[PDB]
Amino acid sequence: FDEDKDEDEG
Amino acid sequence: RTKVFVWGLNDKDQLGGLKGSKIKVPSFSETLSALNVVQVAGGSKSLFAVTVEGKVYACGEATNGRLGLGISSGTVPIPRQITALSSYVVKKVAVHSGGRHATALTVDGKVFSWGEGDDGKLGHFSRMNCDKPRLIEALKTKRIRDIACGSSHSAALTSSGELYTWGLGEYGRLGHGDNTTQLKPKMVKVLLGHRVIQVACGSRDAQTLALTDEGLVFSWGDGDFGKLGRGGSEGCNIPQNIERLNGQGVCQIECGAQFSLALTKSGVVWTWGKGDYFRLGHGSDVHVRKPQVVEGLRGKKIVHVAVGALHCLAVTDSGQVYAWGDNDHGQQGNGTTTVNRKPTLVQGLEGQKITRVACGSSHSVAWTT
Hints:
The complex is a heterodimer.
Chain A (H helix, E strand, L loop, with lengths): L10
Chain B lengths: L3 E6 L12 E7 L1 H4 L3 E7 L2 E6 L4 E6 L13 E7 L8 E6 L5 E6 L4 E5 L14 E6 L8 E6 L3 E6 L4 E5 L14 E6 L8 E6 L5 E6 L4 E5 L14 E6 L8 E6 L3 E6 L4 E5 L14 E6 L8 E6 L3 E6 L4 E5 L14 E6 L8 E6 L3 E6 L1
Antiparallel strand pairs in B: 1-2, 1-28, 3-4, 4-5, 5-6, 7-8, 8-9, 9-10, 11-12, 12-13, 13-14, 15-16, 16-17, 17-18, 19-20, 20-21, 21-22, 23-24, 24-25, 25-26, 27-28
């Protein structure tokens, strides 16, 4: 977990 | 003609018309290459392009009105012109890799802002969002030569070298001696007497960097992970000189997520700050609390650099692009999702003499001139 990592939403 | 290449995360089509969510190899962007761009800039899952004509095009996630296109919910998958600025010639768009607001500077020195309004980062004496660019009235009587945006604050500097900051005051990122939020641009009086020529703003608990025409680098704001470059982790709300960089010839400064980067006239790159996921490029993921030369680039004359959240890009004078940092979304351009612990030559650009790079939160751009 890094607060500044994006999540691949699709 | 300018050939534009993009890669990295593309879930909200922030790469401007490519198929797939993780573009792991630099891919030619036909939509962006047709525009003849002078600058590309990357925000939080967003992309902005300024053309030689002076128009601005945007794509990616449109939440919080971050694209300045009159909307504030969906995504725009094809670069669309910011028609609100069509009567001006824009010179530069400022946006942070983890930013949801942006500013635009025209050739005649006018500044517009748009996007998320929290903490007064747009500078309209308020905290309102703006779906479309709005002229920053407080800067009208000033000839603005450069701009910069963090995630929660913004900056602009005049031709005479005075620096203005505004936005979230917490942890001293604005540099006025207190931690008060400024809803309007306020001049950093401490730096009066230096001609500030560049400024960079960070994200979250953010730092701010400033560069003078004498080569002096100043920093202030949040001190976590040593991103202020003066050792330890203590923050400050007054600009302090980064003594280590004195006499190095710093000509460009940038702020990623919790880390800072400098590039010198002779092509040397320095990084410092949070080390997690190898964003600093020293081979390890430990923190670096004073600026350190990125040894993996020694002997290579770097002419331009860009920083994302957890990744960086550097262009040699011979047109090669080197990348380091995290690769969860392919933003390294090594054809995989494997981290580059050290600066690594990017794939698929041989024969393309790159002169400029840009980064968003998790995506990367390179283009030629």
